[PDB]
RNA sequence: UCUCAUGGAGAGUUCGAUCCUGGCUCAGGAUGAACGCUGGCGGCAUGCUUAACACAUGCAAGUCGGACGGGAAGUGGUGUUUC
């Protein structure tokens, strides 16, 4: 049995005045599962919540929680600065 | 006495009576019918003949994304698919 990298894949909600963010897992063979739920920023604290749920989840590693929340704080400035 | 024929009826009224010419009238069918009285059901039909007179409202001709450039719904994104 081989070492599998449970990849994982960031996906956001565009809405009129607000943006939500979700994070899926990928492994092979097993597809694609979502890790989290849709947080809707800036109503809710949204990066926040997802570093947090990817902090609490002991199989996440360092350098792929902190990739997904180096491209998630590029999307929330994006949408800051639109 | 083979064959064809499945078809043609009258009545009252002019005269004191009659025969005739002659009109009127009636008995029969048919309705895209109307009105009156009365009206249980089913089957198949029919239903502005008058003003080609006016029209409130709603619907009666669209379809093709496999001609084509686009944008708008979502989706995580041009992998999916819709309008
Ligand atoms: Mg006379
Ligand atoms: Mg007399
Ligand atoms: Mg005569
Ligand atoms: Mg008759
Ligand atoms: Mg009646
Ligand atoms: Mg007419
Ligand atoms: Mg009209
Ligand atoms: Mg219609
Ligand atoms: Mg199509
Ligand atoms: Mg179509
Ligand atoms: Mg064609
Ligand atoms: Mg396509």
């Known amino acids: 049995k ?3 990298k449970p990849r994982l894949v960031l996906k956001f909600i565009w809405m ?3 943006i939500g963010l979700a994070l899926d897992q ?3 063979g097993h597809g694609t599962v ?4 849709y947080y809707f920023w800036p109503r809710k604290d949204a ?4 570093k947090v749920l990817l902090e609490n989840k002991p199989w996440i590693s360092q350098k792929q929680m ?3 929340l180096n491209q998630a704080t590029d ?7 639109s």
């Open 75 to 81: 999307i929330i400035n994006l949408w800051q600065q």
């Open 26 to 28: 990928t492994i092979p």
């Open 34 to 37: 979502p890790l989290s739920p």
């Open 66 to 68: 902190i990739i997904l």
């Open 16 to 18: 009129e005045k607000n």
């Open 47 to 50: 990066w926040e919540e997802l």
């Open 2 to 4: 081989p070492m599998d």
